[PDB]
Amino acid sequence: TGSMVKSGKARAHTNIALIKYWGKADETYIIPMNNSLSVTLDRFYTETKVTFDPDFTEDCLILNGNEVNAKEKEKIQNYMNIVRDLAGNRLHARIESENYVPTAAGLASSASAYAALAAACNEALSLNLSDTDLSRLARRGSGSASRSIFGGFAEWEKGHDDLTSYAHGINSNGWEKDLSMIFVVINNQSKKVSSRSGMSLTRDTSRFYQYWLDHVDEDLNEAKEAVKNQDFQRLGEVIEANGLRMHATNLGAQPPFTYLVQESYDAMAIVEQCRKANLPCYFTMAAGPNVKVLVEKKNKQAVMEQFLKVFDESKIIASDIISSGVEIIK
Ligand SMILES: O=C(O)[C@@H]1CCCN1C(=O)COP(=O)(O)OP(=O)(O)O
């Protein structure tokens, strides 16, 4: 690299929320209405390199070898303003990012993408940010990214402001190494659909939102106690119920909506069939119809074959859970 050039590259993995973040207390700083709990996936990640050069005039984002629109470009420049203030400089950056995430198949990349960017910036500019402050930095880009700083189980503490809303890793005595996630890629509209926008309509207008709020802390505690005991059935039951309550809130919105299609329901049925056949597993869904199946690694294949009787082989994608957090790479 050049004399005055400062560069950094980071790999960050996606994470799936087991206890859902859904609805914000603060739209600008991205403060959530409740705590969330997630696991970081071994298979899916983003690699983001940033290069700061004084001669650079504006920020440039190249994604999988391709320039982004003026919209996406404006958004990354605003985010990088946060980085510039934090660093106390006015350097603009060239950002080259590659997503190793099945985005076409509906998996979200925002969590790994902002986690990777945050970590890459910290490496480039030598900011020496703590994991806590890295999480806060990522959170500004996308709420779920706060958790992707960490491996295994992680929890996003909601806080009440920019300083206090961030995530931390949860030690589970290695339990994360025993678990897996199976992704069922569900046929879906290709029309525009937005997570940030949906949770906002629900938070603001949903007749069942208080019902969500009233139960989330109880759920969260039950899940964490479950993790402390490496009690899979216990974790699974509560996260499955939580996930469903999250979707119930959308049904109460003004006017109502859903992210689930009949095929999602079909896959949910296969999950319950598996339980009844002595193959423990539990499902959760995000802002789309894809069904994610939490399963013990020992049962991964057996559960997958149950799905493979109904669904195309291409639509059944498993991932392990990674133990380590964001990493600095070449
Ligand atoms: O992952 C999550 O924790 C929740 C739970 C269910 C799905 N989901 C989401 O889609 C959250 O998507 P985000 O990109 O983090 O929304 P923003 O904070 O506006 O950037």
C-alpha to C-alpha distance for 27 and 142, rounded to whole angstroms: 11
C-alpha to C-alpha distance for 1 and 182, rounded to whole angstroms: 41
Q: What values do phi and psi take at 183, rounded to 5?
A: -100, 120
Structure tokens at 133: 């402050």
**Distance of alpha carbon 5 from its chain centroid, rounded?**
32
SS3 (DSSP) at 282: strand
SS3 (DSSP) at 15: strand
Positive or negative, the Cα torsion across 220, 221, 222, 224?
positive
Residues across the chain? 330
The preferred substitution site among 21, 40, 78, 258 for testing ligand 1, maximizing ligand atoms within 8 Å of CB, is 21
Pairing of strands 179-184, 153-157: unpaired
Decide if 178 contacts 227 (C-beta within 8 A): no
Provide the resolution (angstroms): 2.1
**Distance of alpha carbon 227 from its chain centroid, rounded?**
19
Question: What is the per-residue DSSP string for 133-144?
Answer: HHHHHHHHH-GG
What CA–CA distances, in Å, run from 8 to 47, 127, 153, 254, 326? 11, 11, 26, 45, 13
What method was applied to determine this entry? X-ray
Domains along the sequence of the chain with CATH? 1-184 (3.30.230.10), 185-330 (3.30.70.890)
Provide the angle, in degrees to the nearest 10, between the axes of the packed helices 300-308 and 262-276.
Answer: 130
Structure tokens at 167: 């995530």
Query: Cβ–Cβ contacts within 10 Å for residue 272, how many?
Result: 13
Buried b (16+ CB within 10 A) or exposed e, 237-247: bbbbebbebbb
Decide if 153 contacts 176 (C-beta within 8 A): yes
**HSE (side-chain half, CA atoms, 13 Å) at 245:** 23
In the structure, which protein residues have their CB atom closer than 6 angstroms to any atom of ligand 1? 17, 20-22, 30, 36, 110, 142-144, 195-196, 286-287
C-alpha to C-alpha distance for 123 and 226, rounded to whole angstroms: 36
DSSP H helices, the chain, are 70-87, 110-124, 131-141, 195-205, 209-228, 232-251, 262-276, 300-308
The preferred substitution site among 195, 242, 291 for testing ligand 1, maximizing ligand atoms within 8 Å of CB, is 195
Decide if 156 contacts 20 (C-beta within 8 A): no
